[PDB]
Design an enzyme around this catalytic site. Structure first.
Site, mmCIF file in Angstrom:
data_model
loop_
_atom_site.group_PDB
_atom_site.id
_atom_site.type_symbol
_atom_site.label_atom_id
_atom_site.label_comp_id
_atom_site.label_asym_id
_atom_site.label_seq_id
_atom_site.Cartn_x
_atom_site.Cartn_y
_atom_site.Cartn_z
ATOM 1 N N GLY B 15 4.927 7.478 49.446
ATOM 2 C CA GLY B 15 3.435 7.413 49.550
ATOM 3 C C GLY B 15 2.954 8.743 50.415
ATOM 4 O O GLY B 15 3.610 8.842 51.493
ATOM 5 N N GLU B 21 1.345 9.295 55.570
ATOM 6 C CA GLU B 21 2.415 8.993 54.531
ATOM 7 C C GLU B 21 3.171 7.780 54.533
ATOM 8 O O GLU B 21 3.228 7.226 55.783
ATOM 9 C CB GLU B 21 3.397 10.180 54.731
ATOM 10 C CG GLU B 21 3.013 11.601 54.518
ATOM 11 C CD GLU B 21 4.044 12.789 54.752
ATOM 12 O OE1 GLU B 21 4.960 12.482 55.470
ATOM 13 O OE2 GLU B 21 3.663 13.963 54.585
ATOM 14 N N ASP B 134 -9.912 -4.988 53.148
ATOM 15 C CA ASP B 134 -9.486 -4.002 52.056
ATOM 16 C C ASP B 134 -8.471 -4.617 51.463
ATOM 17 O O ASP B 134 -7.507 -4.022 50.840
ATOM 18 C CB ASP B 134 -9.011 -2.562 52.909
ATOM 19 C CG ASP B 134 -9.045 -1.512 51.913
ATOM 20 O OD1 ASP B 134 -9.747 -1.407 50.840
ATOM 21 O OD2 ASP B 134 -8.517 -0.472 52.208
#
Ligand SMILES: COc1cc(-c2cncc(-c3ccc(C4CCN(C)CC4)cc3)c2C)cc(OC)c1OC
Ligand SMILES: COc1cc(-c2cncc(-c3ccc(C4CCN(C)CC4)cc3)c2C)cc(OC)c1OC
Ligand SMILES: COc1cc(-c2cncc(-c3ccc(C4CCN(C)CC4)cc3)c2C)cc(OC)c1OC
Ligand SMILES: COc1cc(-c2cncc(-c3ccc(C4CCN(C)CC4)cc3)c2C)cc(OC)c1OC
Lengths: 291, 284
Positions: B15, B21, B134
């Site tokens: 990612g 990252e 979120d």
């Protein structure tokens, strides 16, 4: 990244500190008590600031929170100072003029660094300054440790960050306005003035160990003569707020120009009126001038 | 005394975003996931760390915490969050290629509901109540056993803004009562309803499945603006389409009803995570 824990150099209600090895170098590893988890987090917020780095502030290496199942460990890894705390150092050693001024100017330099904003590093008030929270370095200067109670202020944005820590300062070093709980909690200047009070007490502890005319005092902590061992909050409030006590100035100091100047400086740290007290910058400038 | 092995081998990047990252890593044989934060998103590391310093969450449907690490560098501070590693990746990734049957669809959505109710509920003795703020398919990981876990507590609230595509109407029209903890729960329920729609599309019935699409794929652009979302969700009051084919399948009929009850304009009308769990246990 690997560290070897070699010996415990301190253990209390706070947790423990270890001398450890990291890439062949000594490091200090503090393991916090779960009772003090909010100090660990606060100290980690403070050391996030790259421009905090200073020769008179304990050097930061890493902070970790580790957990498996319901067990959490809280680690802070710093520089290791073999000579220990100023409190340790003063027990056993007397000072000459040069060494006494070097110590107290280095603490003033660290405190002025904390208090003064860099435009960055916020303005920082320590809130637990004492001789156990100062380390002695091999160059004869000191560094300030333990930012778990610190308050941060940004003049640019008018933001005061008082943190979330129910911990209070070391009772013996608490200013009158802390002991009588009248301190203005949303006023950054109030926290700086608490540091100045405690600085004055550390100045007194140091100056007692400076020889003049063949005379020195034994190490004693502030208010040793007037409170019980292991004084309570109320014991301290009695002597500082009710009895209006300040540490006694030994009369032998008045024969020595250096100790006479230091006695004057520590009295200007000890006004019951916080706004009358000297600033850390003024203390640093005064000590830079004293011989 | 004792060696403290802190070396983590970073093996591959799984990612890379504006957040920083994520790396597959190794500690002492053990697979771990290492999130390296961008300077842009340091406050997400601080919030997740503050929460875990307050309550050590341990739940099969919450991404497992291992460590928060801050390391001093020459001229910067490096912030790592270390967690369990889930090799099948995010629910978003997983849904792109994979279709589901009735049992795997229900297992996915009930595991999410389970993680979410665990966050939401105050336990006395325990844990504070927590809202995620979120929730979306990229913040859910698929475990090898077919259950999911919820990731990323960088915006969590205990008792950065959320991804715009998943914002509830009261967030978009700025009427949310910000002093009220239940408001934040109701924002998570809205987002859960969108995730339930994303998963249900990939469940096969009578040989039919929908393609993976993100919520509101048909009415907003990629990287929709706040205004783009407000017009769809608040002004026009649009909701994701329920395909006709769902009404031939008892599971998808029941899931359509459930996601409708997550999407009420009036936040206080929405189902609770606990009521969603009970409803899901009675399906099939
Ligand atoms: C952070 O993460 C991991 C850590 C470890 C790990 C390594 N050494 C020692 C420990 C340990 C031993 C003992 C106690 C307790 C037991 C008794 N109690 C009453 C007080 C003290 C806690 C901790 C652990 C947990 C292993 C891991 O995986 C195998 C970890 O996961 C990656
Ligand atoms: C105040 O606070 C922190 C301090 C330190 C720290 C760093 N260098 C050296 C030390 C030390 C070493 C040795 C002694 C000796 C003294 C006399 N002898 C008879 C017993 C032991 C004392 C002190 C410490 C304690 C690390 C911390 O964190 C990692 C601290 O917390 C922020
Ligand atoms: C500092 O940093 C990292 C440390 C570790 C790690 C490595 N070995 C052993 C440990 C350990 C755990 C727990 C205890 C207990 C023993 C029992 N006693 C009653 C309380 C203390 C001791 C040691 C840890 C925590 C891993 C890391 O990464 C996976 C670290 O970096 C984030
Ligand atoms: C959402 O948030 C966090 C997630 C994770 C996390 C944990 N396990 C596995 C993953 C992962 C592994 C692999 C792939 C892909 C790679 C290529 N191909 C598509 C196959 C699979 C995707 C994802 C992640 C990203 C860790 C986090 O922190 C350490 C996160 O932040 C809290």
């Amino acid at each position: 990244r690997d560290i070897t824990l070699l010996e415990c150099v301190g253990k209390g209600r706070y947790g423990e500190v270890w001398r450890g090895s990291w890439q062949g170098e000594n490091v200090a590893v503090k393991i916090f008590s779960s009772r003090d988890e909010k100090s660990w987090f606060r100290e980690t917020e403070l050391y996030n600031t790259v421009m905090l780095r200073h020769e008179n502030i304990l050097g930061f290496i890493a902070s970790d929170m580790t957990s498996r199942h319901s067990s959490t460990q809280l680690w802070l890894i710093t520089h290791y100072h073999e000579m220990g705390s100023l409190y340790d150092y003063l027990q056993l050693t007397t000072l000459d003029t040069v060494s006494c001024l070097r110590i107290v100017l280095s603490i003033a330099s660290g405190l002025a660094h904390l208090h003064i904003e860099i435009f960055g590093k916020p303005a920082i008030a320590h809130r637990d300054l004492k001789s156990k929270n100062i380390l002695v370095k091999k160059n004869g200067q000191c560094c300030i440790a333990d930012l778990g109670l610190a308050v941060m202020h940004s003049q640019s944005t008018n933001q005061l960050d008082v943190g979330n820590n129910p911990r209070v300062g070391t009772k013996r070093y608490m200013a009158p306005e802390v002991l009588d709980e009248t301190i203005q909690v949303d006023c950054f200047d109030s926290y700086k003035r608490v540091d100045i009070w405690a600085f004055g007490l550390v100045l007194w502890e140091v100056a007692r160990r400076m020889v003049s005319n063949g005379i020195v005092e034994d190490y004693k902590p502030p208010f040793y003569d007037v409170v019980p061992n292991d004084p309570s909050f109320e014991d301290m409030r009695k002597v500082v707020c009710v009895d209006q006590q300040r540490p006694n100035i030994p009369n032998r100091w008045f024969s020595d120009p250096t100790l006479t100047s230091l006695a004057k400086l520590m009295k200007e740290c000890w006004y019951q009126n916080p706004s009358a007290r000297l600033t850390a910058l003024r203390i640093k400038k005064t000590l830079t001038k004293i011989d």
